[PDB]
Design a protein around this motif. Sequence first.
Motif, mmCIF file in Angstrom:
data_model
loop_
_atom_site.group_PDB
_atom_site.id
_atom_site.type_symbol
_atom_site.label_atom_id
_atom_site.label_comp_id
_atom_site.label_asym_id
_atom_site.label_seq_id
_atom_site.Cartn_x
_atom_site.Cartn_y
_atom_site.Cartn_z
ATOM 1 N N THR A 19 0.840 -1.190 0.000
ATOM 2 C CA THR A 19 0.000 0.000 0.000
ATOM 3 C C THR A 19 0.878 1.243 0.000
ATOM 4 O O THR A 19 2.065 1.174 0.316
ATOM 5 C CB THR A 19 -0.914 0.054 1.228
ATOM 6 N N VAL A 20 0.283 2.381 -0.336
ATOM 7 C CA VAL A 20 1.003 3.640 -0.323
ATOM 8 C C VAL A 20 1.515 3.975 1.070
ATOM 9 O O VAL A 20 2.630 4.474 1.213
ATOM 10 C CB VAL A 20 0.151 4.802 -0.857
ATOM 11 N N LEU A 73 4.665 1.952 1.752
ATOM 12 C CA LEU A 73 5.807 2.564 1.069
ATOM 13 C C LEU A 73 6.270 3.814 1.819
ATOM 14 O O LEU A 73 7.465 4.001 2.064
ATOM 15 C CB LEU A 73 5.469 2.877 -0.389
ATOM 16 N N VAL A 74 5.319 4.651 2.216
ATOM 17 C CA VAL A 74 5.659 5.865 2.946
ATOM 18 C C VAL A 74 6.363 5.530 4.263
ATOM 19 O O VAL A 74 7.310 6.211 4.644
ATOM 20 C CB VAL A 74 4.431 6.774 3.198
ATOM 21 N N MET A 117 8.825 4.209 -5.088
ATOM 22 C CA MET A 117 7.518 4.294 -5.737
ATOM 23 C C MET A 117 7.497 3.500 -7.058
ATOM 24 O O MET A 117 6.439 3.107 -7.527
ATOM 25 C CB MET A 117 7.081 5.751 -5.938
ATOM 26 N N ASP A 177 0.882 5.241 -10.863
ATOM 27 C CA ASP A 177 0.028 5.456 -9.700
ATOM 28 C C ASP A 177 0.703 6.244 -8.568
ATOM 29 O O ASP A 177 0.276 6.173 -7.417
ATOM 30 C CB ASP A 177 -0.546 4.127 -9.190
ATOM 31 N N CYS A 178 1.738 7.016 -8.883
ATOM 32 C CA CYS A 178 2.372 7.800 -7.827
ATOM 33 C C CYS A 178 1.445 8.921 -7.368
ATOM 34 O O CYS A 178 0.959 9.685 -8.187
ATOM 35 C CB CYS A 178 3.705 8.392 -8.288
ATOM 36 N N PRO A 179 1.179 9.008 -6.054
ATOM 37 C CA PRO A 179 0.469 10.171 -5.501
ATOM 38 C C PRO A 179 1.202 11.469 -5.833
ATOM 39 O O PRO A 179 2.426 11.507 -5.778
ATOM 40 C CB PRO A 179 0.522 9.931 -3.993
ATOM 41 N N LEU A 239 3.884 12.706 -3.377
ATOM 42 C CA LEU A 239 5.196 12.072 -3.371
ATOM 43 C C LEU A 239 6.009 12.459 -4.590
ATOM 44 O O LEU A 239 7.229 12.583 -4.513
ATOM 45 C CB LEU A 239 5.071 10.545 -3.257
ATOM 46 N N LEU A 261 -3.382 12.096 -0.457
ATOM 47 C CA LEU A 261 -2.733 10.984 -1.165
ATOM 48 C C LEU A 261 -3.611 10.382 -2.257
ATOM 49 O O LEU A 261 -3.130 9.605 -3.092
ATOM 50 C CB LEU A 261 -2.324 9.871 -0.196
ATOM 51 N N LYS A 262 -4.898 10.722 -2.233
ATOM 52 C CA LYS A 262 -5.841 10.202 -3.216
ATOM 53 C C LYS A 262 -5.522 10.749 -4.596
ATOM 54 O O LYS A 262 -5.807 10.107 -5.605
ATOM 55 C CB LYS A 262 -7.283 10.561 -2.840
ATOM 56 N N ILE A 299 -3.653 11.312 -7.693
ATOM 57 C CA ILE A 299 -2.626 10.607 -8.447
ATOM 58 C C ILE A 299 -2.173 11.487 -9.602
ATOM 59 O O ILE A 299 -2.951 12.288 -10.126
ATOM 60 C CB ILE A 299 -3.174 9.275 -9.007
#
Length: 265
Positions: free
Chosen positions: A111-112, A115-116, A191, A221-223, A226, A257-258, A260
Amino acid sequence: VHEFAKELDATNISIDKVVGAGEFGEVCSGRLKLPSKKEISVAIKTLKVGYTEKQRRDFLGEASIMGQFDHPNIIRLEGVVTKSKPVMIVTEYMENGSLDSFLRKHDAQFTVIQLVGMLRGIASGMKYLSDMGYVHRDLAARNILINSNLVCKVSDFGLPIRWTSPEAIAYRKFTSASDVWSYGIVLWEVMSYGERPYWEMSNQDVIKAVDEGYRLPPPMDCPAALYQLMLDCWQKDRNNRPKFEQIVSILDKLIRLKIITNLLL
Ligand SMILES: COc1ccccc1-n1c(-c2cc(O)ccc2C)cn2c3c(=O)[nH]c(=O)n(C)c3nc12
């Protein structure tokens, strides 16, 4: 060397496996019995047989640096063995290996937030590193180790065009701000799940393209948050890059973060 590095007794060390190869010799995993009798898993860098005085001094030089750091996101030095052979550097053991090969095995499986979490850890270790007056110069996903709980720790204090800031490439201007540039590349690497920065572009083109203002594209799909962080770390003017403390602060907010999102100009 023994100023910051504890001499270990070899009799307290068992070797269980060969986990890879380093510049100076095999890397192994095993166990270390501590003075308190507790037994821990360790990784072990060994110095190849037949080494020269210069190799030994350079090999062990890493331990003198590593020994000055005590932080949850910097690889922990357990000690060295010099009084017997082979010569060794012994650290805590990281179950999941290098961050870049770990992520390549798990493309799009995290999940994001996960990763964070990893990214926050790396940033915190680097914040401490720069606080101590050290410039890493080799900050790269392959130099980050990750454990069974996904905790990431900075390693490889031995000192790489793809990870180096423009000014450091141009005239060796290494500062904490060039490390921040490197962190940006690591952030891209994470990412991207272990993709190679700039792929297989020839070195001269990586140098020229980056100098011209071109930057790695947003990974899939990178936010946006980020990605913009990557761009900040890659400001041409190094004085415009965030400090590690701000990077840590930024990642702590995203973790709490939603939106993209060939190189982009
Ligand atoms: C970044 O990892 C390494 C790269 C080159 C050589 C050895 C390792 N290296 C190190 C290490 C790193 C250091 O900077 C100093 C001392 C050591 C023992 C710990 N580990 C581990 C480890 O704890 N677990 C692993 O699975 N692998 C593949 C490792 N590779 C390394």
